[PDB]
Scaffold this active site. Structure first.
Site, short mmCIF file in Angstrom:
data_model
loop_
_atom_site.label_atom_id
_atom_site.label_comp_id
_atom_site.label_asym_id
_atom_site.label_seq_id
_atom_site.Cartn_x
_atom_site.Cartn_y
_atom_site.Cartn_z
CG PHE A 149 57.17 93.61 19.35
CD1 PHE A 149 57.59 94.85 19.79
CD2 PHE A 149 57.80 92.47 19.78
CE1 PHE A 149 58.74 94.95 20.56
CE2 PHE A 149 58.92 92.56 20.58
CZ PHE A 149 59.42 93.81 20.93
CG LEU A 174 61.85 97.40 22.99
CD1 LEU A 174 61.86 96.82 21.59
CD2 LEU A 174 62.26 96.27 23.91
NE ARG A 219 60.73 87.05 20.02
CZ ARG A 219 61.22 88.05 20.76
NH1 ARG A 219 62.42 88.56 20.59
NH2 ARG A 219 60.44 88.60 21.68
CD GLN A 250 65.22 88.43 18.11
OE1 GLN A 250 64.24 88.83 18.75
NE2 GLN A 250 66.19 87.77 18.72
CG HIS A 259 67.05 95.85 22.89
ND1 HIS A 259 67.58 94.65 22.80
CD2 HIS A 259 66.00 95.81 23.78
CE1 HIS A 259 66.88 93.87 23.61
NE2 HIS A 259 65.94 94.56 24.21
CG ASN A 289 70.21 93.06 24.65
OD1 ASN A 289 69.36 92.64 25.43
ND2 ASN A 289 70.32 94.36 24.43
CG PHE A 348 64.62 94.10 17.34
CD1 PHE A 348 65.65 94.10 18.29
CD2 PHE A 348 63.60 95.04 17.43
CE1 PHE A 348 65.63 95.05 19.32
CE2 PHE A 348 63.57 95.94 18.49
CZ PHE A 348 64.59 95.96 19.43
#
Lengths: 220, 164, 220, 220, 220, 220
Positions: free
Chosen positions: B59, B121, B54, B62, B125, B101, B112
């Site tokens: 951004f 975030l 992904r 991942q 995370h 997660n 990521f």
């Protein structure tokens, strides 16, 4: 346990099966005598906490004593955390790991972390701390396993002084007290509880007489 | 003292470059050991030959699902999932390596790499490492991803291991 | 089992007959009690799957327990094969093919392949996985050998408190249902089943009482 | 055996006095129980036919079993020589000749030829074939020592299910039937030969009966 | 209790009388039962500590339970003061000082301070903390009002299985020792205390049986 | 539960105490009957999972039924997880994550997450799914609480047709079956179990006679 390996570099050597068999045999044959503490301290020289956990798990029977040992290890870890909390201070230039009550007890600490804490410079005495805890627990256990109190030790009418002093000193070694209390007890209790026939003999020698003089006096 | 691991990245088998990571084992030790051990493959399973499933331009990238290869799997070296170790470190910029997660205390092996500052975030995370060498290799990877994450070519961890 | 050399590398070594003899003797003499899992884990550190299959096949008698262990290993291998499917086709030159569950068990693979798996870069811990499976099987076996349940414990009018707590903690370690459930049990069931006189002596100390004072209360 | 030197050439080594003493001891102590075959396969690993012949000759007593084992080895060698032609004439250097059955038996060869056949490229498992023959012979022997048959096992009215299934699995391990027939036997006769009470218990348990649930049902 | 407005902000609101009336009626009519805690948590959502002190002081009768709750709140307040110590030095301009353990209860603070604490930026949930404390106190109260222990449950020969399982789960929800221990109890104690006929009917389904089939077995 | 607030912006409004009192009263007098499922669906329109948990916790007594409901909710959650897998990873800033199987039951999902899942565009029907689960559980419970089966319904000799048909249709509604089976069940059971005189009276009307004609036949 780790051992000095040629040349000058300590590497991890797993616990040998013969050592575990010797430990199981000494716990089977001798139960929980005062002497086991030295045998345990000598069988596990420089042992990682995992090795001591293995040696405490390999025991057969006496599960109550093992439970007291585990609970006293937990209490020592709890007190250790209380006596060694992280107070705010400037961070050290060099970082070394740190052993928690649970990191010392080998519960949540991987073998690599313990090897690190031991072989790092300066070394962290996790093995000796856990050994002190287990030795305190074993002292508790051997003082519990005492069949009779030291105050009840009395000689029989025809029981020779040999067996009497042997049993008396054995129970006194199993008993727990400061050294000065023992120094007072060996002078106040030993001569009094003896058989009157040899009690008169020990009294004739003197109050501050040594053990060998009395022993050769009532000899035979 | 803090471990360093690398990833040799590949785009459909053509070698693309090496990204290397400093893992902050002095603040997030259990999180850093899990990424270190999965990179070496010393516990039997790991990242080598898994892909970034992904990639969202601007951004993050991942990856890390080595069991199901699509974000629904992966497992840690402590079992399938473990706790959020702590939140000392924050998402301050590109190159920060943070744990993916499925809500709190669900860390496995997905991670990521941020390619932007993602302060939203924070607190959600665990951050446990940062790119050391190779950030333009992470940036070039963005071109093979999309707004929704779907990537256009297979992007793999061709090899990975520990350097120091 | 593999052993490191002077320069740090490791290579296969033939299994020592002393290890096999000690394992068979402890299995015969100590039957299947909680203290066989630590000794098993200590005896076969770094042992290949062939060595573990040796140590299991060599156990004469108690064939039902060995069949239970074989069934448990079979289920674990099936689950491992289901959770980690193996790839087909040509294998890379620098990588050896990953083992399947039946090959993690060591049933259909040569010793050289086990050594290559264990000394690969990065190393693959087939021995540790199969040892974990065997330890789980042995846990199930020692669960099966448990003579009585935890709830049926009731102290007799003459049975001393020491023997009562010994039996209690023995079957408690043999139960291994959980840790917090064990902690709740040692608080409630331990004091719930005492003899009336010593029972009220323990209730005099309240629930805050520890095991040491719990025992020295009924002592003497 | 042939110990493989660390990062070096595999070096031949004479069989250890400890290994031979353990072998003769287990033979003398346990006669011919079904576990002697696993323990023999464990002690003799990577050993030459000379080593295997020595390990067989050191056995004292049970000369009927020894002669039967030698006859089995002779039959296997005859079959091998019949289904494998032997070449003759001038042989190219650096390539050992065709190993005959009498040579793979070790009765007409030397340690040099055995090591040559075990170091060739590709290697020829002379040791692994002679060990297979010895295991076939030992299987015949342990089948001959079987005191009772498997179809004639009946549980006593007071003899518990644990002892019954122990005897049943011991006789099953001793049995000579193939593994496919071996499964149906333990599926059917185990519940078909038990006492009526736990027989009806397992009948109420129904299909998919496994040993663990069977033993938990027949409790008490 | 605070209430949101059209613009989105919240401000204090006088406590509604038919909430106090409903709480007093449910406390008296249902006395103390496990279903008083959900009703209390639903009645006083967002209530200030003054409102909770109102809802507690308004309970006439059962003064021993209210004193237990007061003692539990007392101990909880002391723990909060011990766990966090107020910081020294200059305070930031955008921030002001926090409440104490006793002021969380609202015993020594006015209503305006509670409203300022609850609607501050960031908001401080004093109401939720005091509600958690009151819920813990009510849990201890409903524990005390339990009329039996979990182990003493034994179904009578005529008492239907429905009433037995109802009583069991009632005193189990009133036990609240833990959650996994509850999971073990519902497996063991539920199956261990049935009437012999329906007992063996449940044993016919094995431990894999669920509660629905468990009851429809003994049903009819 | 959330409600459309002027203008067009749904905001969270906590559950009113009067609704909870109505629910407690209907679960105090009506107890468990077919009418409770419709009453529950009307009292909890558009309720967040927290509100449904509050309404299920406030029920006093009938703990077996509540445990059945909780277990069926867990089963439905497991089935939803097996049918709708949730992918792990960082969430998008604009849209919310897909709720897991336990996020529906309000166990580990905070109220804010549920409000988000409901007010987002497109909305996630967590409330309706949890309501379907609770309705399945309530159907199970009301089909369990049936005193007798539908096959056992028989009219007394002088028991009027009114009470007979009322009781029969009540038990048929409480019973669980497909409507297609009920279409045959009524035409096979209603006329047969009636009184002989009324049986002939209804058979004189015909097999496919409607309920009103069958009633006005034996009216008075």
């Amino acid at each position: 346990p780790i051992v000095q390996n040629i040349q000058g570099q300590m590497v991890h050597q797993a616990i040998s099966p013969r050592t575990l068999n010797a430990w199981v045999k000494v716990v089977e044959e001798k139960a929980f005598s005062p002497e086991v503490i030295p045998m345990f301290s000598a069988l596990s020289e420089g042992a990682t906490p995992q090795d001591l956990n293995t040696m405490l798990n390999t025991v057969g029977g006496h599960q109550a004593a093992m439970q007291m040992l585990k609970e006293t290890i937990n209490e020592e870890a709890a007190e250790w955390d209380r006596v060694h909390p992280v107070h705010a201070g400037p961070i050290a230039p060099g970082q070394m790991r740190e052993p928690r009550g649970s990191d010392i007890a080998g519960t949540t600490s991987t073998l690599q972390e313990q090897i690190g804490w031991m072989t790092n410079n300066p070394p962290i005495p996790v093995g000796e701390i856990y050994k002190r805890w287990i030795i305190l627990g074993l002292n508790k256990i051997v003082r519990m396993y005492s069949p009779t109190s030291i105050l009840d030790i009395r000689q029989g009418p025809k029981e020779p002084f040999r067996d009497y002093v042997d049993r008396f000193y054995k129970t006194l070694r199993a008993e727990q007290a400061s050294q000065e209390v023992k120094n007072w007890m060996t002078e106040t209790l030993l001569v009094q509880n003896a058989n009157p026939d040899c009690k008169t003999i020990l009294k004739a020698l003197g109050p501050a007489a040594t053990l060998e003089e009395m022993m050769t006096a009532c000899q035979g | 003292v803090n471990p360093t691991v690398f990833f040799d990245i590949a785009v459909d088998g053509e070698p693309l470059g090496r990204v290397s990571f400093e893992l902050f084992a002095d603040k997030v030790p259990k999180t850093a050991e899990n990424f270190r051990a999965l990179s070496t493959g010393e516990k039997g399973f790991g990242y080598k030959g898994s892909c970034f499933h992904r990639i969202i331009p601007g951004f993050m990238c991942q990856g890390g699902d080595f069991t199901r290869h699509n974000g629904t799997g992966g497992k840690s070296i402590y079992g399938e999932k473990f706790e959020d170790e702590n939140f000392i470190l924050k998402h301050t910029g590109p190159g920060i390596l943070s744990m993916a997660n499925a809500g709190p205390n669900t860390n496995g092996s997905q991670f990521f790499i941020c390619t932007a500052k993602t302060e939203w975030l924070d607190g959600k995370h665990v951050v446990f490492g940062k790119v050391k060498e190779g950030m333009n290799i992470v940036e070039a990877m963005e071109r093979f991803g999309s707004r929704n994450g779907k990537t256009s070519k297979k992007i793999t961890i061709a090899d990975c291991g520990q350097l120091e």
